[PDB]
Amino acid sequence: NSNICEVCNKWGRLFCCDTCPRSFHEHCHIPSVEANKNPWSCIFCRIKTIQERCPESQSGHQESEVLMRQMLPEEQLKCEFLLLKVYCDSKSCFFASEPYYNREGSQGPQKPMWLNKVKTSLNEQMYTRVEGFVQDMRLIFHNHKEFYREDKFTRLGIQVQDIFEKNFRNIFAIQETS
Ligand SMILES: [Zn+2]
Ligand SMILES: [Zn+2]
Ligand SMILES: [Zn+2]
Numbered sequence: 001n002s003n004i005c006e007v008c009n010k011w012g013r014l015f016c017c018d019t020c021p022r023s024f025h026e027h028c029h030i031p032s033v034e035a036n037k038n039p040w041s042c043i044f045c046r047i048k049t050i051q052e053r054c055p056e057s058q059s060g061h062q063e064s065e066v067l068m069r070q071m072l073p074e075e076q077l078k079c080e081f082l083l084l085k086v087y088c089d090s091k092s093c094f095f096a097s098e099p100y101y102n103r104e105g106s107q108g109p110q111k112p113m114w115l116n117k118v119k120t121s122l123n124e125q126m127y128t129r130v131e132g133f134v135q136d137m138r139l140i141f142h143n144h145k146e147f148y149r150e151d152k153f154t155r156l157g158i159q160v161q162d163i164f165e166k167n168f169r170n171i172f173a174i175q176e177t178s
Contacts, residue, residue, distance in 0.1 A: 006044075007088050017042035030084045030119065043081050047171070050074055060175025067131040078171050079133045080122060085167040086115065086137075091160050095140050101147060109143040130172075137164055 001016040007028035014023040018039030026033045029042065041049075051057055069075050086092050096115045101108030118136050127133045141164070144157035168174070 019045045030080045058173045066172045113139045
């Protein structure tokens, strides 16, 4: 197994996947690494199983259809993975915890949002459809762009949004377009 956490790339108290060589801190894995279960399979492994059980799940889909899906166990897991993929980028640190807004010439957003809030919402089963999760994720970056205006710090929102959007297309197998 790996000697660093797959998500944050640090050593520490790691849990090892029994079916691939990745390792995780307890609360870096999403969902949090489970108390018992030997063997244990990580979310990358669980997602791969879904695809292997239903190869056709990788044919192209329309985003509008994906968003209306009910959050049954497999959609729940896909959203958890997609969230985890964003945390894997170091620039997610800027969006992880609750922000605040006091900048000359700008007003804070109407509806602040951050990754740990989305994490809790997923954990507490607050989303009924994929759309709920995706809207909150996009809002994070949209709020950032709107607040930081012409400061070059706005680019961090663009960068992390691109990570989100690419992984969304991949995980939910959105039909490739030009
Ligand atoms: Zn970690
Ligand atoms: Zn694994
Ligand atoms: Zn099938």
